Amino acid sequence: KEEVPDNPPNEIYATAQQKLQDGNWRQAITQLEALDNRYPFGPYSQQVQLDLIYAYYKNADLPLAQAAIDRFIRLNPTHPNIDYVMYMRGLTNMALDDSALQGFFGVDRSDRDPQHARAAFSDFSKLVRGYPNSQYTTDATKRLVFLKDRLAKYEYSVAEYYTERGAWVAVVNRVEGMLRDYPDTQATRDALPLMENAYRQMQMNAQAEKVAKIIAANSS
Amino acid sequence: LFNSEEDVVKMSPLPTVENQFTPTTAWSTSVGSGIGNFYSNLHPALADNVVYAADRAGLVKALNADDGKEIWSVSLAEKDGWFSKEPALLSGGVTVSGGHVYIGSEKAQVYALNTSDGTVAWQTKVAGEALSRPVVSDGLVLIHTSNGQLQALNEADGAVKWTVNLDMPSLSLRGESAPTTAFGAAVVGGDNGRVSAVLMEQGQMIWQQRISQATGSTEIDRLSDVDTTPVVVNGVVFALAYNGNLTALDLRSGQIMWKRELGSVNDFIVDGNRIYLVDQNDRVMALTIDGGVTLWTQSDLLHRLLTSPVLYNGNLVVGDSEGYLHWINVEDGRFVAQQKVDSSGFQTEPVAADGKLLIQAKDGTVYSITR
Amino acid sequence: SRYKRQVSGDEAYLEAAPLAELHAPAGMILPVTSGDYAIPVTNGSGAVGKALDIRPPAQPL
Amino acid sequence: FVVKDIHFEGLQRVAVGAALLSMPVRTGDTVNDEDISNTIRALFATGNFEDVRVLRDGDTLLVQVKERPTIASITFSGNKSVKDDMLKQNLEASGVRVGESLDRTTIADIEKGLEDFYYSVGKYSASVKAVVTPLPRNRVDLKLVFQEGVSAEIQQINIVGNHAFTTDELISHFQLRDEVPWWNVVGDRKYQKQKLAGDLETLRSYYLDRGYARFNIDSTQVSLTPDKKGIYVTVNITEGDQYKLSGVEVSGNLAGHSAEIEQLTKIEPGELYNGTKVTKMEDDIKKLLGRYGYAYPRVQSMPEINDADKTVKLRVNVDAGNRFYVRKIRFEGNDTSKDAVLRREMRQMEGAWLGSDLVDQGKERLNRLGFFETVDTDTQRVPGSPDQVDVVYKVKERNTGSFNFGIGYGTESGVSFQAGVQQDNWLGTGYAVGINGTKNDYQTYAELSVTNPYFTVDGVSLGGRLFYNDFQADDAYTNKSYGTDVTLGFPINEYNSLRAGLGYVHNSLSNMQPQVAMWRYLYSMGEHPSTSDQDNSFKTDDFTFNYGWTYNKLDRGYFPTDGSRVNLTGKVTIPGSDNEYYKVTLDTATYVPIDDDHKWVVLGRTRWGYGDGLGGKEMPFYENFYAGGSSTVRGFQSNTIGPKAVYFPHQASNYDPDYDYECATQDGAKDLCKSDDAVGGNAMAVASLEFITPTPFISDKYANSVRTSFFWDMGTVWDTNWDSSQYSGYPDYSDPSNIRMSAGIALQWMSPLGPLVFSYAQPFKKYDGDKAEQFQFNCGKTW
Amino acid sequence: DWKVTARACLRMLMSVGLNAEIRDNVRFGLEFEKSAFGKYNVDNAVNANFRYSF
Amino acid sequence: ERVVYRPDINQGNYLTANDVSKIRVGMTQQQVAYALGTPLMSDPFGTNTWFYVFRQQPGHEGVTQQTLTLTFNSSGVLTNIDNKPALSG
């Protein structure tokens, strides 16, 4: 680390704010957590938590940042600028997904444990429905339109190995659970031709004509 | 992994010597291969100028007390096999009463070898391994096994007469302190502090008693248990505990007199109401008469594992775990005398009979010592 | 350094396909939904993409 | 009295609102000294800082608490045998963790609470000294130091009360060890309270398989000597008597299934009681009901031991659920690993019923997959329906991958480079593309395996591989062979497999000595080398076709005592190769127990594989079979059993490598060197039988990791057609009746670092020309 | 973090060595392999690897 | 009969010969849920029809199916119990 020379004053946070508004997080993170470690009670104690969360997020920090957010939410769940802390908490959950490989981003990662996307859609919905007159509300809907589609493409991708294995009840259940969760998204009007290859594979020709009555009338 | 096995206590640096006696060893004789590293009391007995021995794996001899020659080198081992045999783990000091020689074992056995030729007279299995000395008391051969039992065998031929059960903690220290005779009784000790006063004839427990405090921690700081040497004299009953005060009891009632905490580990000795002890740190604390003064003590032998006192003509002879024999005085002990280095370590109780000073090493090299 | 794409911000979530509803044909019924459902528009003037300044409150006073 | 003004002076660290709400009194309340006492209790319970004083004189309540440095800046000293994070999480879950305003009346408390943990680890010293230095503005830097000694050592575990059985054979199957020598390492003298309850259970499980039905452990004591360095344990077994099994009658509530259970519970009258054949009969009934649509089968059995006779009559009852549907599968925890590779390693279809064995045998395959650390499982009942459940697995990756890089020295062979990376997890699915390299001063090896184990997904693998070998060496030939191959992995069932695939290799050899043993390969296939010059070369293009079937019924981890294993390999160059031949390789490793005790066994291994070319052209000499060494025929040197080559006056060897090549090299034997160092013929047939006896003579405590043996080796390697024209000056090499038997003794040894194989054989039958040597201590043998 | 293991045998049947992994599963092994390159010769080539477990 | 590898494939609603023979006309939609178990597939397309399908693929060269299809009227009463114990090929 480094011996930050804060005598009493905010002259130690001045150089940390200057380094934060400099495109350099790793050097300005210790400069913030030191003032946080030694003076987390005075006037310069409320802004240090938000400035530290913003420095941990831009530095691509692990759930330690989520814990720092959940600690700011637990102590004082009342703030005229509270919609930012929930947006950041949803942003970390959303950003905890895009890896797709050991060190590269080349393949369409949409079927790798979608437990964090469901751990972000909930918070984004709670934010967009609680305070609808904020400034971070326009991007929340544009992010949910993609996040819910991403879970639709995971359901459609988990409902495809069972249709080639030979178990024509699992794809039926997974499409029934998709037609009532993400109906108006993508990867759902394309799994209808995948529920018809199962209802017809179990001698139910009198029940697959209903699927081939939405396929031929509710699509192109 | 530079080097493991560090140290914490760094025991005494073996200070200087003030020899005024220069004690010598008349003779010595090895007896098989002793315990080596297993903690088990095994001291040589003595009868009509004949000193016996023992072993944890094999033979038990009857070497002479003036020359050191064998009389009967019986094996007392088990059967054989393809190319090796299995040993008979023996523990418990040798006891002599008339013409019998009782030796306990760690396989629930009690051998009764004769003095004529060493032929076993009788053998009866007991419950639990024997870790205490067989106590001869008006025929009875009461023995405190390592199970909380006080089985009292007969002298003629086996005939286990009666056993008494005692409580046992989760993790105890040792199953020592076989009982002693007291006007036709048996003042036995026992684990977990309790000290019983069972009867001689059938074993009806007259009274029990707590000996020290407990609840210091989960298991480690409440390990207090009297297992050293229940002694009775002038009606007063002393019995050394492990953590707290020793004892102050009575034959009939058993009420608590003076409760001096000083002295709590092993082998107190009464020689005229002058009780010398060691207590959790190998210092010779000559305890008081009844509470208070605690006349004097020692500080040169700290953390050097010593043994039971010997009291050779007033001088408090005692050996440490390195093989030294620093003599002590009786009024103000300041290193009166000391012997040379006897290797292999000393871990058994040195017997102090009339004359000689027999003591067994960790392999068996008993020395008669004079000055 | 396994998560460096969605840190500085990018237009990856944007330009996605819209959410078009499904209108059942006359005679049959659809498996009515519940739970995960897109909230109403609630439009405004907030920036989207890289124009929205992700920063803590001003002072914050 | 009505208070009018609340007086709070100083407000050091507690919030103003918190200080206001902590006080049950406000402006305009009438209270007494009892409520003042309750306020003192509240200030003591809030735990920030409590140096309080109360004064009530006029109209205001003067309650004030003095500040004190009572923050949590724990730092650890030089602990030796403990990790820095264990005490960290201990103090986290139990106190002084950052904040919480640690007080002065808790230092001894946390000291004892941490010492009772050192006691649990097994270090009975517990010397902890914790000081707190006060920093300005209510800060303390608490620093603790440790003074620990040597831990405890497991002393004798002598058992009292056991008859008809030696004391050492019992501890042989124990976990807590008390005698670890430099000879081998199986355990360690370390006390573990959790491990004692498993040893006390395996003792019962071992003493019950012999018919000793009555079994009750009276007491199990554990003690330690003063100046604690050793620990003694005692077990009081009571055997009672021996009994035999009489009846296995079954009764309970079954869905008309007794007709197939009476066939699984029948027993032979007179058989001795077996303590592990009942646990297996229970698991065999727990499977017949599970296969019929029952999730959790409950089976119990009570033995009815009848006294005054050797009879026990077990009574068994069963009850197994109703339907317990399992129509859900969810995987969570995997990152950068596709879901599609987790569902193919298990046998549990979604929507079907639940089997208590399928969801447990899928975890075994998920563990055997390889790129997983911990794989848990949980079966949760959904709200509503009482039978439909969801099974979820919690996995954690291991971060598979490697990058090997090595450089050699001047070791009389030259500097050698080595570089390899596979990482085994190329992209999500589970490919294993890797690149290797062994760049020595003569070798230029390189691996290019791009194997794929689940193409056409039923269990069948498919793997391509490229290679380049440049093994510049001598024979008395500098080879250079490059190609590729692609084979599949057809799985039949457990302990069975079948591989088949295509291949191609172009090989060119040069700088070879003209030995007549291999000097009919070119004279028949087009070429016609001269008997004067040596720089001649030769090269072919091969189109191979490999096949084979695998079988490994070992039924043991690494010390087989029963079973067998056979494998065959083939190669045919059908349509376009410059040389047509075929080479089989069959070998068995069967084991045979002589009695109902896994201590006296006798095994026998054979090897075959005679193969000759077809089409009027001979078989290449670089694919010949070599036999010998400590692997096939113990007692002989490395791979020198075949026919001995001989040369002719072709001494132009182009500046001989100075003793690297001998025997009619440029400065060798002019006429008929009659070479040693034989070259293996096409035919081959070896066999060896070997008895195994217990090791004499060591203590029974560690007498199960030696496994000495008496073997008897033999074999032969001849050439089907060497020659018959005027070559009657050398021993005939076409006679298969040239076996060279060699018996001896073998001494395996599981050292503290791997296994080793020691063998001192003695060849008692040999002909003219044989390199004999003994004491071959080859290691690494685990197959 | 010095965490040597001193493995021995886990064509060569040789190379007793150690595993000096410290920070990120990166070792400093020094094997003593003794392999047969021809037919009857096992001489040399002690070596040392890197073992970068990325 | 290509004997290489084919795991056992079973799909839901294990039926017997002593459970189907208890269903009669118009009892309720409740006793049917506890006599044989909760159905594995319903028809969300605006009807109360339940599908009890017992299909298994045992080993090699075998497919057996039993399509027990029953439909309940509005608010309880069953009227059109239908059993199909043979896989129509």
Residue numbers in the entry:
A (entry chain D): 24 to 243
B (entry chain B): 22 to 392
C (entry chain C): 29 to 89
D (entry chain A): 24 to 499, 504 to 810
E (entry chain G): 1218 to 1227, 1257 to 1300
F (entry chain E): 24 to 112
Sentences copied from the publication:
Alternatively, we developed a dual expression system to purify a crosslinked BAM/MBP-EspP complex directly from bacterial membranes. We used our low resolution structure as a guide to design disulfide crosslinks between β16 of BamA and β9 of EspP using a construct of MBP-EspP containing only the last four strands of the barrel domain (EspPβ9–12). Following iterative 2D and 3D classification, 149 K particles were used for the final reconstruction and refinement to 3.4 Å resolution. In this improved structure, we could clearly observe strands β9–12 of EspP and unambiguously assign residues for β10-β12. Loop 5 is mostly disordered, although appears to curl inward towards the lumen of the BamA barrel domain. This state represents what appears to be an early intermediate of the biogenesis of EspP by BAM and demonstrates the formation of a hybrid-barrel between EspP and BamA. The β-signal of EspP was found to be fully paired with the first strand of BamA, with the side chain of the terminal residue F1300 extending across and over G424 of strand β1 of the barrel domain of BamA, positioned in proximity behind F426. The first strand of the barrel of BamA pairs with the last strand of EspP, supporting the notion that the exposed edge of the first strand of BamA serves to initiate strand templating of the barrel of EspP.
In Gram-negative bacteria, the biogenesis of β-barrel outer membrane proteins is mediated by the β-barrel assembly machinery (BAM).
